[PDB]
Design a protein around this ligand. Structure first.
Ligand SMILES: *[C@@H]1O[C@H](CO[C@@H]2O[C@@H](C)[C@@H](O)[C@@H](O)[C@@H]2O)[C@@H](O[C@@H]2O[C@H](CO)[C@@H](O[C@@H]3O[C@H](CO)[C@@H](O)[C@H](O)[C@@H]3O)[C@H](O)[C@H]2NC(C)=O)[C@H](O)[C@H]1NC(C)=O
Ligand SMILES: CC(=O)N[C@H]1[C@H]([C@@H](O)[C@@H](O)CO)O[C@@](O[C@H]2[C@H](O)[C@@H](O[C@@H]3[C@H](O)[C@H](NC(C)=O)[C@@H](O)O[C@H]3CO)O[C@@H](CO)[C@H]2O)(C(=O)O)C[C@@H]1O
Ligand SMILES: *[C@@H]1O[C@H](CO[C@@H]2O[C@@H](C)[C@@H](O)[C@@H](O)[C@@H]2O)[C@@H](O[C@@H]2O[C@H](CO)[C@@H](O)[C@H](O)[C@H]2NC(C)=O)[C@H](O)[C@H]1NC(C)=O
Ligand SMILES: O/N=C\c1nc(CCCCNc2ccnc3ccccc23)ccc1O
Ligand SMILES: [Cl-]
Ligand SMILES: [Cl-]
Ligand SMILES: [Cl-]
Ligand SMILES: [Cl-]
Ligand SMILES: [Cl-]
Ligand SMILES: [Cl-]
Ligand SMILES: [Cl-]
Ligand SMILES: [Cl-]
Ligand SMILES: [Cl-]
Ligand SMILES: [Cl-]
Ligand SMILES: [Cl-]
Ligand SMILES: [Cl-]
Ligand SMILES: [Cl-]
Ligand SMILES: [Cl-]
Ligand SMILES: [Cl-]
Ligand SMILES: [Cl-]
Ligand SMILES: [Cl-]
Ligand SMILES: [Cl-]
Ligand SMILES: [Cl-]
Ligand SMILES: [Cl-]
Ligand SMILES: [Cl-]
Ligand SMILES: [Cl-]
Ligand SMILES: [Cl-]
Ligand SMILES: [Cl-]
Ligand SMILES: [Cl-]
Ligand SMILES: [Cl-]
Ligand SMILES: [Cl-]
Ligand SMILES: [Cl-]
Ligand SMILES: [Cl-]
Ligand SMILES: [Cl-]
Ligand SMILES: [Cl-]
Ligand SMILES: [Cl-]
Ligand SMILES: [Cl-]
Ligand SMILES: [Cl-]
Ligand SMILES: [Cl-]
Ligand SMILES: [Cl-]
Ligand SMILES: [Cl-]
Ligand SMILES: [Cl-]
Ligand SMILES: [Cl-]
Ligand SMILES: [Cl-]
Ligand SMILES: [Cl-]
Ligand SMILES: [Cl-]
Ligand SMILES: [Cl-]
Ligand SMILES: [Mg+2]
Ligand SMILES: [Mg+2]
Ligand SMILES: [Mg+2]
Ligand SMILES: [Mg+2]
Ligand SMILES: [Mg+2]
Ligand SMILES: [Mg+2]
Ligand SMILES: [Mg+2]
Ligand SMILES: [Mg+2]
Ligand SMILES: [Mg+2]
Ligand SMILES: [Mg+2]
Ligand SMILES: [Mg+2]
Ligand SMILES: [Mg+2]
Ligand SMILES: [Mg+2]
Ligand SMILES: [Mg+2]
Ligand SMILES: [Mg+2]
Ligand SMILES: [Mg+2]
Ligand code: NA
Ligand code: NA
Ligand code: NA
Ligand code: NA
Ligand code: NA
Ligand code: NA
Ligand code: NA
Ligand code: NA
Ligand code: NA
Ligand code: NA
Ligand code: NA
Ligand code: NA
Ligand code: NA
Ligand code: NA
Ligand code: NA
Ligand code: NA
Ligand code: NA
Ligand code: NA
Ligand code: NA
Ligand code: NA
Ligand code: NA
Ligand code: NA
Ligand code: NA
Ligand code: NA
Ligand code: NA
Ligand code: NA
Ligand code: NA
Ligand code: NA
Ligand code: NA
Ligand code: NA
Ligand code: NA
Ligand code: NA
Ligand code: NA
Ligand code: NA
Ligand code: NA
Ligand code: NA
Ligand code: NA
Ligand code: NA
Ligand code: NA
Ligand code: NA
Ligand code: NA
Ligand code: NA
Ligand code: NA
Ligand code: NA
Ligand code: NA
Ligand code: NA
Ligand code: NA
Ligand code: NA
Ligand code: NA
Ligand code: NA
Ligand code: NA
Ligand code: NA
Ligand code: NA
Ligand code: NA
Ligand code: NA
Ligand code: NA
Ligand code: NA
Ligand code: NA
Ligand code: NA
Ligand code: NA
Ligand code: NA
Ligand code: NA
Ligand code: NA
Ligand code: NA
Ligand code: NA
Ligand code: NA
Ligand code: NA
Ligand code: NA
Ligand code: NA
Ligand code: NA
Ligand code: NA
Ligand code: NA
Ligand code: NA
Ligand code: NA
Ligand code: NA
Ligand code: NA
Ligand code: NA
Ligand code: NA
Ligand code: NA
Ligand code: NA
Ligand code: NA
Ligand code: NA
Lengths: 536, 534
C-alpha cells in the first residue's frame, strides 16, 4: 500500500487501513503534534513537535493522558466504556486522522472531535470515538486529538509563568493549528473545518468560539450536551489558585518566587500522585463539579464565557447544539443521596432537599429554596418517583440544558444560524436502569456510526438511525445546514431562534419539530437565579 | 297581619310581608341597632341604640353609609349593581331581618350576611343581597347589617382615643350582639349563628374568627372570595397613621392627634370621600385606603399570625373562590385594560401592570412575579399576558390568602369545606375574557334567579336552588352535603394534604385537588422569604 504513507511537514507516517462493512478507510493513529510535556514542561503550554526522522508508526492509538480512572461500578459497560483503553502517560499529545481509502481528489470538509471527560478524563482512543464509519459513510475527514486533562492540563496559578492554566485548551488549539497545516495531505479542506465535541469537549468547542486566536482555525462548531457558560466549565482566578495551592499541600509542597517554587515542587511528584489527590481539592461535596477546569485568567478568554457570549457578534457562523433527554440522571447515582443504579433510587423529601444542595453547590439558602420551589409538585411533594425525576431535572437543567439554551438563543440572536436537537432514543434493554432514560453521552455512539459495527449487537433500525444521524452531522459540516439541500420532501429541521425556540427530536421516528428547550425552567436558571445571588 | 309586629328590647317594630314565587316572607328592614355616629361620634366606636317609644317603621331599607360611588362606567349594569341604591348618610347603622312568614315554632339557624366592598363601599340594601328566596326556600332567619366603610369606619390614629380604628368592624360586632339578644323574637336560634360574606365581608368574617370577643357571637363561618390574611385586608399602625395624616393634609386639616381628629369631624362627609383614594402610597389595584388595622385591640396580631396558633378545633368553615378573581379589578388601574376592548395588552403593559397589581414590593420581588406567570415560549402573546395578569391579581389577593387560611384551619381541627364557583351567569354584562369575575356568585347564593322580574335561565334556576341548599345545609348542620344522596357526589372536607374542593356550576359536583397549589406555594411560602431577605 502507498496511500498508507503520508508525509506531513514534520516527517513521514505509516498509516493503517481499517475495515468498514461498507468499504476501507485509511487511518493515521498516534501522530505527535507536540513535544512530550514532561519535566519542566508540565503545566506549561505545549510547543510543536519538532521534525523527526524515519517513518512514525501511525498504526495504533498512543497513550492516554494521566487521569483519574473511575472505580464506581467495576466491570459495568456503562462506566467502563469511558475509562482509558491505553496506558496512562504524560507523553500523550497525539492526534488521529481518518480519511477515505480512495484519498479524496477534491478537498472535503474536516470534522475535528474534542472528547469530553469533565476536564479530568477522556481520550481520543475510546471505542465510541472510532471515526471509521463516519468517514466511510460520508467521505469526510475525521480528526481527533488528545489533550491534557486534570491538573496536568488545567492547574492554574493565575499570573505566574510556570502555571498559566488552560494549557489543556492550548493542546486543542495546537492540534487545530496542526490541522490547518497538514490536513491537506489527507484530502481535507482546511477552510472547511468543523469542531464537534461532547460535554467538556462541547465546552471546549464553545471556548474556541469565544477565543479570538482559535476562531481562525475552524469554520463551524457543534456542541453536544455541553456549553462553555455552564456552572462547571470555568472557575475564577481566585478559585483556581485556591485549588492549585491546596493540591500542593495534599502532596506536601511548602530567583524562584513562591508560585515558581510551588510549581517546581509539584513537578517533582510522580503523575499518579497528583491524580490520587485531585478530588480532595473541591470545596464542598458536590455533583457535576470538577477540580481543574478552564480558568478566566484573561489570556484565553477576555472575560467570562457569559460576558463574551452576550457582547459578541457571530455573523457568518453556523452552530449545531443539542442535549440528551435525561441529562442529570447519571450524575445522581455518583454522588446524590439515596441514588443507585440497582435499587430504582426512590428518594424521600429529606434526600431530595439534601440532593439540591449537592447538585447546586455554593448558593444561598434562599437560592436553594427557589430551586425547591420550582422543582416541587406541591400537590404530591413527597412522591418518591416525582422527587427522583425532579432532582434529575435540577442537575440536568442547571448544568447542561439551560447553558445550552442560553448559548443557542444568544448566538441565534447575534448573527449565527443555530440548529438544535434533543436526543431521545434509548435501547429497549440498556445496561442502565429505565428511570434514567437517555443518560449523558448516549448519542455519541450513534453519531459515530458505531451501530454499523458488525461485532456489536445493534438493531437493524438503529443502524438506519445512525446513518441518518451521520448524514445530519456531515451535511452540517459540509454546508452549515443539517438538512438535505436537494430534498424539500424530507422532514425540515428549522433553525433555532430566540423567539420560536424550535428544535427537532432525534429517535427512530422521523424528525418532529418541538418548541421550547425547557423554556420555563431555563428562565429561572439563566435570568431570575443570577439576579438572586447579586441581591442577596 | 299579626306576623308583622315584633318587639325587641329597644321597642316595637312593624314589618312588611314580602312576596316570593314560592310563598310570603316577613321582613323587618332598617332596624336601628346603634346611635347615629355623627358629629362628635364620627370615627368613634358605635354606641348601642337606646330604646324608643312607639313603633319603628321597618318596611323600607335605611340610608347607605357615606362611600365612594363608582362613576367610571356610568349606567353600566355591572358596576351600578354595587353602587349605593339609597340615600347616603352617616346615619346608617341599621340592620335588616328576614324570617319565614309562618314564624318557626322551634329555634331556627340564623344566617348573618356581611357585605363586602373593599371596606370602602357596600350596603345591605342592594338587590343581589335581597334575602327573600333564601329565607323562603330554606326557612332560615337571615340578618344583614350596615357597617361604616371608608374613613368613617377605618380611619385609625393608633393610640388616640378619638380614632382607634376598626370601628366599622365594631359596627358588625354590635350587630352580632343585637342578634344574640333579639333574633329569638323572629324565631331564630342565637346558639346557631352562621356568618357569611364576600370579599371584604369574607375578610370581616375571618377577622371575627381571629378576634376572641366575637367568637361568642356566632358558631359557623363562610368566607366567599376573601380572607383576613389577604395583602389588602389589613394595614399596620404605622401605615394607618401615615394614611390618616395624609387625608388630613389633603382636606386642609392640621394633643396634636386630638386637634387633628376634631378638624376631620368638621369637614363634610363627601369631602373626605373625594380624597380617600389619594392617600394610597403608590398607583395600585385591589388596594384600599382605609382597611382594618392591626392595633392590638380588635386584632392582637397580624391575621397571618393569629391563624398559625388559634382556637379552631371543631369550627365549621366554608370557603371558596370564583374562577377569575382578578379580572374585574384590572379595569381600575391596570394599563391597557378596559371592558370595551379585549384588553390585549403588550408585554410593556404587562410588566407595568405587575408593579400596580403587586405594589409595595422590591424590584427583585416583582421579577419573581414576572417569572412563574410568564409563558416563556410565548412571552409576547397579548391574550396570554392578559390572562396571566388576571391570575397574578387573583392569586395574590384572593385565591392564595384563602388557600393558606383553609389549610391552616384544617390543620388545627376545623372542618373546612372548599369550593370554586365557575359558572358564568347568562345575564352577565361583563366581557367574556373576564370569565366568572369577582363577586358574581352572590346572585345565585341569594336565589336572585328565582326572581320572576329577572330573565335568568331555566337551569340556572335549579342551580341557584342547589347552592341555597348547600349554604343552608351548612348553617343547620355544618355540612353542606347533608343530603344522604348516593346519586349525588359527596363534598369532601378540605385538608392540608389532600386539598380537595368541589366545582360549582351547572354540572353536578366535581371533586378536584389543589387550590392553585403551584402558585400559592410561591405567594405563601417563597415570596415572604424573598421580601425579608431583600
Ligand atoms: C383598550 O382600551 C383602553 C381604555 O382606553 C379607553 O377606552 C377605549 C375603549 C377607547 O375608547 C380609548 O380611547 C379610551 O381611552 C386603552 O388603554 C390605554 O391605557 C393607556 C395606559 O397605558 C392609556 O394611554 C395613555 O393615556 C392618556 C389618556 O388617553 C394619554 O395621555 C396618552 O396618549 C395615552 O393614550 C390610555 O388610557 C389608553 N389608551 C389610549 C389610546 O388613550 C387602549 O386603547 C386599549 N388597550 C389595549 C388594547 O391594550
Ligand atoms: C376601641 C374600643 O373602644 N375598644 C373596646 C370595644 C367596644 O368599645 C365596642 O364594642 C363599643 O361598641 O370592643 C370591645 O367590645 C366589647 C364590649 O366592651 C363588651 O361589653 C358588652 C356590651 O357592652 C353589651 N352591650 C349592652 C347593650 O350595653 C353589654 O351587654 O355588656 C357586655 C356584654 O355582656 O362586650 C364584648 C363582647 O361583645 C365586646 O363587645 C372588644 O373587646 O374589643 C371592648 C374594647 O375595650
Ligand atoms: C439505594 O442505594 C443507595 C446507595 O447505597 C449503595 O448501594 C446500595 C444498594 C447498598 O449496597 C449500599 O450499602 C451502598 O452504599 C442507598 O443509599 C445509601 O444507604 C446506605 C445504607 O446505610 C448508606 O451508606 C448511605 O446512607 C446511603 N448513601 C448514599 C450515597 O446514598 C439507598 O438507601 C438505597 N435506596 C433504597 C430505596 O433502597
Ligand atoms: O453502555 N450501556 C449503555 C450506555 N450508556 C451511556 C451513558 C452513561 C454514562 C454517562 N456519561 C459519561 C460518564 C463518564 N464519562 C463520560 C465521558 C464522555 C461522555 C460521557 C461520559 C452511553 C453509551 C452507552 O452504550
Ligand atoms: Cl453490573
Ligand atoms: Cl463501548
Ligand atoms: Cl464525567
Ligand atoms: Cl469561581
Ligand atoms: Cl475569589
Ligand atoms: Cl479549594
Ligand atoms: Cl469534595
Ligand atoms: Cl462527576
Ligand atoms: Cl428535554
Ligand atoms: Cl446557564
Ligand atoms: Cl443567516
Ligand atoms: Cl419545501
Ligand atoms: Cl418542494
Ligand atoms: Cl429537508
Ligand atoms: Cl422547507
Ligand atoms: Cl418548555
Ligand atoms: Cl421543554
Ligand atoms: Cl419547562
Ligand atoms: Cl417541562
Ligand atoms: Cl372603571
Ligand atoms: Cl333614600
Ligand atoms: Cl369590590
Ligand atoms: Cl348563643
Ligand atoms: Cl365560634
Ligand atoms: Cl354559638
Ligand atoms: Cl403580603
Ligand atoms: Cl400588611
Ligand atoms: Cl371633636
Ligand atoms: Cl356632612
Ligand atoms: Cl359636617
Ligand atoms: Cl399602595
Ligand atoms: Cl377607602
Ligand atoms: Cl363541634
Ligand atoms: Cl367555636
Ligand atoms: Cl382555579
Ligand atoms: Cl384601567
Ligand atoms: Cl385606584
Ligand atoms: Cl403587596
Ligand atoms: Cl414555575
Ligand atoms: Cl400546626
Ligand atoms: Cl348580573
Ligand atoms: Cl337541592
Ligand atoms: Cl393545582
Ligand atoms: Mg512514508
Ligand atoms: Mg467512503
Ligand atoms: Mg467563520
Ligand atoms: Mg451563565
Ligand atoms: Mg460561571
Ligand atoms: Mg487527601
Ligand atoms: Mg463523572
Ligand atoms: Mg464522579
Ligand atoms: Mg453547597
Ligand atoms: Mg454556583
Ligand atoms: Mg399541581
Ligand atoms: Mg431521569
Ligand atoms: Mg435581564
Ligand atoms: Mg360619593
Ligand atoms: Mg428595591
Ligand atoms: Mg405550599
Ligand atoms: Na456490564
Ligand atoms: Na456487570
Ligand atoms: Na465515568
Ligand atoms: Na456502548
Ligand atoms: Na461525563
Ligand atoms: Na445515499
Ligand atoms: Na449558573
Ligand atoms: Na461558576
Ligand atoms: Na455561574
Ligand atoms: Na466552577
Ligand atoms: Na467548579
Ligand atoms: Na466555582
Ligand atoms: Na479554595
Ligand atoms: Na509519573
Ligand atoms: Na479523590
Ligand atoms: Na469527589
Ligand atoms: Na465531600
Ligand atoms: Na456527580
Ligand atoms: Na462529581
Ligand atoms: Na451568519
Ligand atoms: Na460559518
Ligand atoms: Na458524586
Ligand atoms: Na459552583
Ligand atoms: Na464550587
Ligand atoms: Na450567594
Ligand atoms: Na412553583
Ligand atoms: Na413550577
Ligand atoms: Na414543576
Ligand atoms: Na445553569
Ligand atoms: Na438561527
Ligand atoms: Na450495551
Ligand atoms: Na442495571
Ligand atoms: Na455514545
Ligand atoms: Na437525507
Ligand atoms: Na432527506
Ligand atoms: Na426550508
Ligand atoms: Na434551515
Ligand atoms: Na430566549
Ligand atoms: Na425538552
Ligand atoms: Na416541557
Ligand atoms: Na430556554
Ligand atoms: Na418544568
Ligand atoms: Na448563576
Ligand atoms: Na306576613
Ligand atoms: Na354610635
Ligand atoms: Na351584570
Ligand atoms: Na357614618
Ligand atoms: Na360591600
Ligand atoms: Na328584600
Ligand atoms: Na331569602
Ligand atoms: Na376565641
Ligand atoms: Na362556638
Ligand atoms: Na398576606
Ligand atoms: Na394587593
Ligand atoms: Na404612607
Ligand atoms: Na357632606
Ligand atoms: Na372634595
Ligand atoms: Na395614583
Ligand atoms: Na390607581
Ligand atoms: Na382595584
Ligand atoms: Na407583636
Ligand atoms: Na390562642
Ligand atoms: Na368549635
Ligand atoms: Na368536633
Ligand atoms: Na381557574
Ligand atoms: Na365586578
Ligand atoms: Na380609574
Ligand atoms: Na384606578
Ligand atoms: Na391609574
Ligand atoms: Na415559569
Ligand atoms: Na385568567
Ligand atoms: Na397552601
Ligand atoms: Na398550622
Ligand atoms: Na372562566
Ligand atoms: Na323551579
Ligand atoms: Na340539613
Ligand atoms: Na333539611
Ligand atoms: Na345546615
Ligand atoms: Na399543606
Ligand atoms: Na396541576
Ligand atoms: Na393556576
Ligand atoms: Na418555601
Amino acid at each position: 500500500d502507498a496511500e498508507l504513507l503520508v508525509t506531513v511537514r514534520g516527517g513521514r507516517l505509516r498509516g493503517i487501513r481499517l475495515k468498514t462493512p461498507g468499504g476501507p478507510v485509511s487511518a493515521f493513529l498516534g501522530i505527535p503534534f507536540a513535544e512530550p510535556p514532561m519535566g519542566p514542561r508540565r503545566f506549561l503550554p505545549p510547543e510543536p513537535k519538532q521534525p523527526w526522522s524515519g517513518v512514525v508508526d501511525a498504526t495504533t492509538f498512543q497513550s492516554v493522558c494521566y487521569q483519574y480512572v473511575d472505580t464506581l461500578y467495576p466491570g459495568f459497560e456503562g462506566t467502563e466504556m469511558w475509562n482509558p483503553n491505553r496506558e496512562l502517560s504524560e507523553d500523550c499529545l497525539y492526534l488521529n486522522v481518518w480519511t477515505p481509502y480512495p484519498r479524496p481528489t477534491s478537498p472535503t470538509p474536516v470534522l475535528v472531535w474534542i472528547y469530553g471527560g469533565g476536564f479530568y478524563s477522556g481520550a481520543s482512543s475510546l471505542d465510541v470515538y472510532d471515526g471509521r464509519f463516519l468517514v466511510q459513510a460520508e467521505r469526510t475527514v475525521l480528526v481527533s486529538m488528545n489533550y491534557r486533562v486534570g491538573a496536568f492540563g488545567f492547574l492554574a496559578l493565575p499570573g505566574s509563568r510556570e502555571a498559566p492554566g488552560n494549557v489543556g485548551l492550548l493542546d486543542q488549539r495546537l492540534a487545530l493549528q496542526w490541522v490547518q497545516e497538514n490536513v491537506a495531505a489527507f484530502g481535507g479542506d482546511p477552510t472547511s473545518v468543523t469542531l464537534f465535541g461532547e460535554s467538556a469537549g462541547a465546552a471546549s468547542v464553545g471556548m474556541h468560539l469565544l477565543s479570538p486566536p482559535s476562531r481562525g482555525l475552524f469554520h463551524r462548531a457543534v456542541l453536544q450536551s455541553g456549553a462553555p457558560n455552564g456552572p462547571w466549565a470555568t472557575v475564577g482566578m481566585g478559585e483556581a489558585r485556591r485549588r492549585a495551592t491546596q493540591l500542593a499541600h495534599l502532596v506536601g509542597c511548602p530567583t524562584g518566587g513562591n508560585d515558581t517554587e510551588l510549581v517546581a515542587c509539584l513537578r517533582t511528584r510522580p503523575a499518579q500522585v497528583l491524580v490520587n489527590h485531585e478530588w480532595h481539592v473541591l470545596p464542598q461535596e458536590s455533583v457535576f463539579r470538577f477540580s481543574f477546569v478552564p480558568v478566566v485568567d484573561g489570556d484565553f478568554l477576555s472575560d467570562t464565557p457569559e460576558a463574551l457570549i452576550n457582547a459578541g457578534d457571530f455573523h457568518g457562523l453556523q452552530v449545531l447544539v443539542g442535549v440528551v433527554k435525561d441529562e442529570g440522571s447519571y450524575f445522581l447515582v455518583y454522588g446524590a443521596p439515596g441514588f443507585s443504579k440497582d435499587n430504582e433510587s426512590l428518594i424521600s423529601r429529606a434526600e431530595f432537599l439534601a440532593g439540591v444542595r449537592v447538585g447546586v453547590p455554593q448558593v444561598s439558602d434562599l437560592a436553594a429554596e427557589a430551586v425547591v420551589l420550582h422543582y416541587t409538585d406541591w400537590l404530591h411533594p413527597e412522591d418518591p418517583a416525582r422527587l427522583r425525576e425532579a432532582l434529575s431535572d435540577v442537575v440536568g437543567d442547571h448544568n447542561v440544558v439551560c447553558p445550552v439554551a442560553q448559548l443557542a438563543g444568544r448566538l441565534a440572536a447575534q448573527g449565527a444560524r443555530v440548529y438544535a436537537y434533543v436526543f431521545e432514543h434509548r435501547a429497549s434493554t440498556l445496561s442502565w436502569p429505565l428511570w434514567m432514560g437517555v443518560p449523558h453521552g448516549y448519542e455519541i455512539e450513534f453519531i459515530f456510526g458505531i451501530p454499523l459495527d458488525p461485532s456489536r449487537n445493534y438493531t437493524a433500525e438503529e443502524k438506519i438511525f445512525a446513518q441518518r444521524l451521520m448524514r445530519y452531522w456531515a451535511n452540517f459540516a459540509r454546508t452549515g445546514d443539517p438538512n438535505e439541500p436537494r430534498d424539500p420532501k424530507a422532514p425540515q429541521w428549522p433553525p433555532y431562534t430566540a423567539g420560536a425556540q424550535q428544535y427537532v427530536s432525534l429517535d427512530l421516528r422521523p424528525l418532529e419539530v418541538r418548541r421550547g428547550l425547557r423554556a420555563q425552567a431555563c428562565a429561572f436558571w439563566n435570568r431570575f437565579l443570577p439576579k438572586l445571588l447579586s441581591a442577596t
